[PDB]
Structures are given as structure tokens and as C-alpha cells.
Amino acid sequence: VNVLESKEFGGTTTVDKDLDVTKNVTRTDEPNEDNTPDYFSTGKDRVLVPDTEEWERLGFGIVAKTVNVRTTDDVLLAFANPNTNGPTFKIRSNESPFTIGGDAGIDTAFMWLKKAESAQNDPAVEIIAYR
Amino acid sequence: NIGNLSAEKQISLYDGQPFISEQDVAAGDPNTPALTIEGPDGYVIAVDAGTPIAPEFRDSNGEKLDPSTRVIVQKCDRQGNPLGDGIIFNDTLGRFNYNKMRTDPDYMRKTAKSLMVDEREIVKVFVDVPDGANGYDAERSRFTLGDDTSDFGKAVEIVDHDDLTEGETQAVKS
Amino acid sequence: NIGNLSAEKQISLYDGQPFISEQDVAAGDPNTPALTIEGPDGYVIAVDAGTPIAPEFRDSNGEKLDPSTRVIVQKCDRQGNPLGDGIIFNDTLGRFNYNKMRTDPDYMRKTAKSLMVDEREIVKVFVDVPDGANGYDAERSRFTLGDDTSDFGKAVEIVDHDDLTEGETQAVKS
Amino acid sequence: QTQEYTLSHTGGLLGSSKVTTASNQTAPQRETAIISFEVPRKFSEIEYVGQRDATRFVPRTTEEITGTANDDTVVQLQANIQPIAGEEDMADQDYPVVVAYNVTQGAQVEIADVNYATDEVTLATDPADGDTVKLWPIMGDGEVQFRLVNQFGQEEGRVYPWATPLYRWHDFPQLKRGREINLHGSVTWQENETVEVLLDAPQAITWEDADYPEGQYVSTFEQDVEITL
Amino acid sequence: QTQEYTLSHTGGLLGSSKVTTASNQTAPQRETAIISFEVPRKFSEIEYVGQRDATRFVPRTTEEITGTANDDTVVQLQANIQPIAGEEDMADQDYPVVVAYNVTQGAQVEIADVNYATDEVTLATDPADGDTVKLWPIMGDGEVQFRLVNQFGQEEGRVYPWATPLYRWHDFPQLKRGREINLHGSVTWQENETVEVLLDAPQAITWEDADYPEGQYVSTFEQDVEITL
């Protein structure tokens, strides 16, 4: 079982580096599940939250190492459950386009969201889960 | 001579103390805490499953506010941040019958569960006045948490952090 | 979702029910029952050794009748027939202190023994007014048999006859 | 992660949007609904347990009474009155069984004496001709039940089939351990599986009038629960 | 050979020589001493045990109020007032929260009504111009502690470091098992190892005036002990 774990680690390092994995030679021929990465986004249409006392939820189909957000209004956020043990995390519309993640691989999913006190609605756009 | 005592000490909290804090409140502003308890340094405190409260919350004119008023005790970590995981005593106001409920075993309103408070952790007393009512004042009001003088009631248990070896464990608990 | 429940159910009887019956009464006529409980079809009921009663029996003018008045609860089989073998709560009237005895554990007047009532068996409430007193009315009066809301008192136990296999046995008991 | 909490006739854990209040049907008596409890955005579930959990409910009605030059001081009511915890001594009822308020004189109207089971009242003051007064006696002679909804209106059924009366409700003194109420029933409802209380009675009910003196809310319902966060 | 006993603000087991009474400092608030307890000639020791032993303390202040031709009937006090056991109904307070006495007319001065938390009072009678009246409201808004002395003034320290308030003291009804007071502390002191109670408050205190009607002693402190003979 020790050498089995060694083989598993070798396969994991292979999938990570994508150097010893010769699957790329066939992946480049045409798209498949292996070439095509899975991720999440939203359509062109901005997503709206004109309401409060209302913690919008968003269920990614995958864990996400990083994110990317664009808006036109100040809002709140929490990647933990905002109601039970969740830290607030607020937005300034000036610094609306941004990201977090990457090297700091966060094991997040099922994000939450909500409007904050402003003078309009919070149309949002999002790009997530390069994982 | 004086008799030795344990680190554990049985007490009863209230308004006129240094580390506690308060403020006035207006109607229709439940998010404003009228009381802000605040962990002293090197002093853990503790509350078992059931302990009295004397939620005396009267008007400027010395009158208990509307019975539709509500009280929510609530734990808070640092960052001035409320918390849902950990909350005590969601109840109304016009229910307690102040004059006797500070005394009798029966009126006596105990907590929902236990609690612990490290050297700096906050607790807040949110007060949902419905709207259009009379405002709140504190000087014409009080508040308590324990029954330490008596023989049937419970009391708050304080300990000095230096007198323990599980302090790191409770710090991990938070 | 709803939580499942047993056939046994804990209740408290009173005047304004369909199957119960009542009538007015005049003085010096103890044989007139002011209340006539009457077994519903397919519903056995049960009373353990001790259960409260609220024998509220007032005047037309809303006044408890003379303290020399007496109350006798009494079992009856069919045929409208009273029965000595099986009888509960022989007591006076001007004793109960109505206003509190509906509440306190101490005033609370329990039965002499247990009871069972098949799908059609009668119970009667005979009322010995001595003579020359004020008559009885029911609309200005009440009556009860149980304490089901509370936590110290007892309650009446009803069962649907279909949900048993000992129903034949209890029928033989009668 | 189970913590006990309290509900209200107003807002609280629902923001006055996941709850409603309502009057009842009177001319045909109907076991109508007066109040609901919709699960809000957040919770996983709610639990009620009679024989473990408490309840409070203070119902009052409304009417309108004019006055006269040779004013009466006396009224009759088509809503049976009783005490709450003990005597009918308004000083020590644990809350009054009647409230009154003159409209012309924007002031209270104190009581002198009650014709107890006659369902009539004597007042302390002397109203004037064409002068309006609003009363708020308590509500008795009526049933109550609970039920449930499957996100549409398809009822699961009811908590506990047998009803409970309101004169009895007033009778049992609230605010006393053991003498508290603990009904029968045991349920659970998740998001949008709203609950609705039901009432069958002749008389009306009143939640608000905007002229009731004592705290904007004529009646109330309040309740304990055991919530999963 | 251990027997329980009782102490007093006066004499008793001390002959009014091994005890003293004293007022307090007001202009600078100081945690001053008002009363001591010196062990007398005889005893081997004394013991106090909070959480086992009882206590009683009825403090009142003093002032002086003139009168007027168009007398006021009304007063304000710079000493917060509360009830003792329940309502502010002077008939049933378990002892009054105010006492009054006219000086010119060597007679009581009965009360009509109290402005409760306003800390003002209405009287029943009508004083006269230049007429003096003495009042004795209760004392609130002040701390209390115990301590000890090593035969000189070198304090051992204190019984229990945390204080206790007097409005609270009044609040808890004396004279009721369980609802009695039982502080925290456990001590012992032999001959001349006197004890001294301490008080920190703005307002004064009063033990005697020689014109107070009810029994020569305006205030009191009384206490239980467990003595070795």
C-alpha cells in the first residue's frame, strides 16, 4: 500500500505538471473532458440583488481556488455561511473589479452574497473556479 | 485571618461596572446595542445552561417600553461582529413582571444554553422596538445576569486566566 | 411535515362541546343532572386515580351557589340508570376558591379513583341544592375535568376504539 | 446546533414580510387564519413541541361607542368577559381585561366597576354627546388550532386535531412555571413550509388600530421554538 | 462549643464600647467606614461565612426642608429612590422608603404619592412658611465591602474584593428563605482583630437624629455569626 500511495502521488504530480502526462498530445487534437476545463461563470447578463435581509446563495459545481467579481454597487460577501459563523466582507464600487485566490488555494464553494446600503441596485458579474 | 478561596467566583453583573458599556437607543433601530459587555484582560467568565436576567429597559419617563419590544442577547467575537452560532435569550419585553421577577424562582428567566467569554470577546443586547414608540434611556434602566446572593438561583462564574493550564484549550475554543 | 402521534391523547373536557350535554336546575332537586357526559361512538376515554375538576356552578346572577350546595359526579351505564358501584367526587360547592383552584397544584381537587367509559356510557353531575336557594344556570357556569396544557397536572386520556385489540376485554368490563 | 428562540406577532426573525396578521370571519363563523409563520431565507428547519414548548396569546376585539348629553356611563358587550388570573380587580389582573379611549378627548377612559358575567361595564368618567370612544375588551368564546402548508396551500393536515378555547386561555395564568401552557403536538417545517394559526369564533379580532394607547399593538401572539440555527 | 448569634448596630454583645457608628465622606466620595465590630473581652473567636450566613442593612439619609405660605407639597431628592420588595405602595413596602416629620408641629407628615424614578415626592399635608421638616429617604447608589484589622490598623486586606450595591440590597426582599442574602467570604478574627464595614457613595448616612420618630435609630445593620462561645 505504501508503493500504491507512491504511484498515486506520481500520477497526481503528473496531472499537476502536465509534463510527464502524454494525454496532452491527444488533447490538443480535439476538445474533450480532459482538455476542456470545468469552471463556473454567468452569462453576459448581469445578476441582480435589489433586496436586503436576503442572503443570496450561489452553488458552484466545484470547489474554487480563485474568483473574480465585477459590479456597479457596494455589496457584502461571505464564503462561509454569513449567518452562523460567516465573516462579513464588504465592497467599494471603486474597487469593484477584483479577484482573490491562486496560490492561496481556498477550499470554498456555495458562496453567499447580499446587497449593501447604497443608492441603487448591485448588478454583478463573476468568473470562478479555475480549479 | 481570612479564609482561602478558589479562583472560581460567583457573581452577578449589572450596569454600573467599568468594563461593561451602554448607550441610549431610539425606536425602530434594533441593530443598536444598548449594552456592550466586553471581556476583561486575563479574566474568563462563564455562564451555565440557565441563569437569570433582569432585563429592565424603561423609558426616559421611567416606564417599561412597549410589550411588543424584544430583547436579543447575542455573543460576538472581536471585530465588533455579531454571530448567529452562539446566541442567548431571544425574548420579548412586556412579559417579565419586573417587580417580582428579580426575586421569585418562578418568573426567573434562565438562559437557553451555556457560554464562555475569553479575555476579549463581546456580548451585545439588541433591542427591537417596533417603531413610533418611546425612546430608550439607560440611567432610568438596569440589567443583570445572575443570582449570587441567594440560595436557589445561579450565578456567573469568573476565573483569572493565570490560574489555569487549559487556557490555551479554551482559547482554541473561542 | 408533522410528527406522528399515538392513539392515546391527553385532553381536558368542558361545557361547550358537542357530545356533552347540560340543563338548568332548580333548588331542592338533587336528582336533576346539570351535566350529562355521553360516550362518543368508537372513542373510549379514561381517567386515572386523580384528575382535577373545576366545578364552576354559579347563579343566574353570576354567583357561586350556596356553600351548603353539593356536587356528586356519578357513573351511569345505559338505560339512563345511575349506579352506586362506580362513583367519583362527592364533595361540597362552597369550598373550591374558583379563581385560583383552576390554577394552583394545591387547591386542585382530584378524583377518588379511576374510570373508564365505553363507546356509549353516561356520566352525570347531580347537584344537591338544599332548598329555597337561587336556581342554577349553565351559560353563567362552566365545568372541567383535566389539566392537559400544564406540566404538573393530569389529563383525560382518549383512545379510538379501532386502534386496539383489548376493546372486547374492556367491553366485557363495562 | 439546536438553539431555542422566540417568535412574535411582529417582525423579529421575519422582517414583517415572512409573517402576516389578519382578522377573521364573523358573520359566518369560520375557522379562519389570523397569523402565519413563513420560514425565512436562512433556516434549515423549525421545530414545535407541545408538552415541552410554551405559548402566549393576548387577544382583544374592538368596537365604537358614542356618547350623549345625559350620558350613560354604562355599556354592554357582545363578547363574553372573564378574568385572567383570579379576580376581576382591574388593579391586579396581570393585564387589564378592558381598555378604553376617548377620541374627541385624546385621552384614556378609566373604569369604575364591571358587571362581571352580565358582560356589562360601568365607567369612571362622563362622555359627551356625539363623543366617540373606542374599547378593546379581551376575546373569549372561541377555538384555536394549528396547521401546516406544503409550499402552496396543500395542507399536510393539522398539528393536533382537537381545539382549545380562549376563555380557558385567559384563565390559565401565564407567567408561572408549571402553570404555563404546553399544548400537544410535534412538528417540523423547512423553508417556505409555512405554518398558520387558525381561530373559529363569532367575534372579531384586532392587531392594530393606530389609536390604541398601550404600545401600537392591540393584541399579540408569542411563542417559543427550537431552531436548527 | 460553636453557637450561632446575632449582632446589631447597637450594644448587644459589645456594650456600645466595642462598637462604633459613623457617617461617611460625601464631597470626595471615599470608601469610608461607618461601623466596626471589635471583639470584646471574652470571646476566643468569631466567624463569618458568606454563602451560609445572613445579613440585613436598612440605610437612610437625612435632609432639611423648609415651608412656604404657598407651600409646595412637592420635593425633589438628590438620592435615588427605589422600592424594597415590589411596588412603591407605601402601605405594603415591608417598611417605608420615606419617612417625614414636621419640627414645628412635632408630628408626622404623611405621604400622598411618589414620583417614582423622577426622585420626587408629593405629600399629603400642607407645611407652613418657615416651617421645618426632616426627611429620611432610603439610601441607594452606593457600594459596600468588608475588611479586617490587625489590632492596629494594618489591614489584612478584604473579605471578598468585589463590592455590592445598595439599590440591589433594597431590591432583594429581606425576610424570605432562599431570597435571603448570602454574600461570599469566609473569615475569622480573635480578640481586638476588629472588623470594619466600608461604604462608597456620594450621599450621607444617618444612624440617629434624636427626632426620628420610629425607635431612636434611623438606620440599622444586623447580621448573623457563628461564635466559639
Interface mutation target, options A52, A83, A112, chain B, most CBs of B under 10 Å: A83
Beta-bridged to residue D225, according to DSSP, are D5
Beta-bridged to residue E71, according to DSSP, are none
Q: What residue ranges do the domains of chain D occupy?
A: 1-59+140-229, 60-139
> Is E217:E112 a contact under the CB 8 Å cutoff?
no
Instruction: Please return the burial class of D61, using the count of CB atoms within 10 Å of its CB with bins 0-12, 13-18 and 19+.
Output: buried
Instruction: Please return the burial class of A16, using the count of CB atoms within 10 Å of its CB with bins 0-12, 13-18 and 19+.
Output: exposed
Rounded Cα distance, D32 and C2, in Å: 20
Comparing CB atoms, the residue among E85, E179, E186 nearest residue B3 is: E186
* Residues of C whose CB is below 8 A from D193: 1
Breaks in chain C (C to N over 2.5 Å), named by the residue before each, are none
Instruction: Please return the burial class of A19, using the count of CB atoms within 10 Å of its CB with bins 0-12, 13-18 and 19+.
Output: exposed
For this entry, resolution in Å reads 3.7
Nearest Cα residue in chain D from C108: D179
Rounded Cα distance, C84 and C75, in Å: 8
> Is C82:C32 a contact under the CB 8 Å cutoff?
no
Write out the three cell numbers for E192. 481586638
Rounded Cα distance, E186 and C121, in Å: 69
Chain CA centroid to CA E197, Å: 11
Write out the three cell numbers for E22. 459613623
What's the 3-state SS for chain C?
CECCCCCCEEECCCCCCCCCEECCECCCCCCCEEEEEECCCCEEEEECCCCCCCCCCECCCCCECCCCCEEEEEEECCCCCEEEEEEEEEEECCCCCHHHHCCCCCCCCCCCCCEEECCCCEEEEEEECCCCCCCECCCCCCCCCCCCCCCCCCCEEEEEHHHCCCHHHHHHHC
CA distances D161 to C160, D88, D157, D158, D207, Å, are: 13, 33, 9, 6, 26
- Interchain pair D215, B92: CB under 8 A: no
> Is C20:C38 a contact under the CB 8 Å cutoff?
yes
Determine the Cα angle at C131 with ends C125 and C136, to 5°: 45
The contact set of D with B (CB < 8 A) is 1, 3-6, 8-13, 56, 94, 175-177, 214-217, 220, 222, 229
- Interchain pair D162, C3: CB under 8 A: no
Write out the three cell numbers for A120. 441603487
Instruction: Please return the burial class of D155, using the count of CB atoms within 10 Å of its CB with bins 0-12, 13-18 and 19+.
Output: exposed
What ranges make up the beta strands (E) of chain A?
40-41, 56-58, 69-70, 75-78, 89-90, 111-115, 125-128
**Number of domains forming the structure of chain C:** 1
> Is C105:C153 a contact under the CB 8 Å cutoff?
yes
Determine the Cα angle at E144 with ends B55 and E7, to 5°: 115
Give the B:D interface size as CB pairs under 8 Å: 58
Write out the three cell numbers for B106. 418562578
- Interchain pair D229, A55: CB under 8 A: no
Rounded Cα distance, B97 and B103, in Å: 10
Closest to A76 measured CA to CA, from A97, A59, A55, A104: A55
B85 to chain A, any CB pair closer than 8 A? The answer is: yes
Across the beta sheet with A69-70, what order do the strands follow? A40-41, A125-128, A69-70
Rounded Cα distance, E203 and E167, in Å: 13
Interface mutation target, options B74, B79, B85, B174, chain A, most CBs of A under 10 Å: B85
Write out the three cell numbers for E76. 425633589
Interface mutation target, options B63, B68, B71, chain D, most CBs of D under 10 Å: B68
> Is D159:D198 a contact under the CB 8 Å cutoff?
no
Rounded Cα distance, D221 and D197, in Å: 10
> Is A79:A88 a contact under the CB 8 Å cutoff?
no
Instruction: Please return the burial class of B120, using the count of CB atoms within 10 Å of its CB with bins 0-12, 13-18 and 19+.
Output: exposed
- The DSSP annotation for E100-161 comes to EEETTTTEE--EEEEETTTTEEEESS---TT--EEE--B--S---EEEE--SSS----BSSS
Write out the three cell numbers for C51. 384528575
- Interchain pair D5, B92: CB under 8 A: no
Q: Tell me the HSE value of D116 on the side-chain side, using a 13 A CA sphere.
A: 16
Rounded Cα distance, B77 and B39, in Å: 10
- Interchain pair B1, E117: CB under 8 A: no
Which SS3 state, helix, strand or coil, does residue A11 take? helix
* Residues of D whose CB is below 8 A from A84: 1, 229
* Residues of B whose CB is below 8 A from D222: 92, 95
Kindly list the partner chains of chain D, i.e. chains with 3 or more CB atom pairs below 8 Å. A, B, C
> Is D204:D61 a contact under the CB 8 Å cutoff?
yes
CA distances B157 to B41, B43, B116, E22, Å, are: 16, 10, 10, 35
- Interchain pair A85, B81: CB under 8 A: no
Amino acid identity of E133? V
Give residue B137's domain range.
1-174
> Which region, left, alpha or beta, applies to residue E27 given φ > 0 means left and ψ of -120 to 50 means alpha?
alpha
Residue E48: its H or E element: strand E46-49
Rounded Cα distance, C16 and A49, in Å: 53
- Interchain pair A83, D42: CB under 8 A: yes
Report how this structure was experimentally obtained: cryo-EM
What's the 3-state SS for chain B?
CECCCCCCEEECCCCCCCCCEECCECCCCCCCEEEEEECCCCEEEEECCCCCCCCCCECCCCCECCCCCEEEEEEECCCCCEEEEEEEEEEECCCCCHHHHCCCCCCCCCCCCCEEECCCCEEEEEEECCCCCCCECCCCCCCCCCCCCCCCCCCEEEEEHHHCCCHHHHHHHC
Rounded Cα distance, E184 and E147, in Å: 13
With touching defined as 3 or more inter-chain CB pairs under 8 Å, the answer for chains B and A is: yes
- Interchain pair D186, C5: CB under 8 A: yes
- Interchain pair E189, B1: CB under 8 A: yes
Chain C nearest CA to D132, separation (Å): 30
Q: Which residue has the cell 440617629?
A: E208
Rounded Cα distance, D207 and D12, in Å: 16
Chain D nearest CA to A124, separation (Å): 21
Write out the three cell numbers for A60. 458552484
Phi and psi torsions of D32, nearest 5° = -90, 180
- Interchain pair B2, E159: CB under 8 A: yes
Closest to E61 measured CA to CA, from E82, E41, E77: E77
Closest to E134 measured CA to CA, from E156, E159, E108: E108
Q: Tell me the HSE value of B6 on the side-chain side, using a 13 A CA sphere.
A: 7
Comparing CB atoms, the residue among B11, B62, B151 nearest residue E162 is: B11
Chain D nearest CA to C162, separation (Å): 17
Comparing CB atoms, the residue among A83, A87, A88 nearest residue B84 is: A83
Rounded Cα distance, D39 and D195, in Å: 9
Rounded Cα distance, D162 and D148, in Å: 15
* Residues of B whose CB is below 8 A from D13: 90
- Interchain pair C2, D187: CB under 8 A: yes
Would you tell me how many other CB atoms lie within 10 Å of the CB of residue C95?
14
Kind of pairing between the strands at C156-160 and B70-76: unpaired
Q: Which of residues 18-57 of D touch A (CB under 8 A)?
A: 40-42
- Interchain pair A83, B81: CB under 8 A: no
Comparing CB atoms, the residue among D3, D176, D214 nearest residue B113 is: D3
* Residues of E whose CB is below 8 A from B3: 49, 185-188
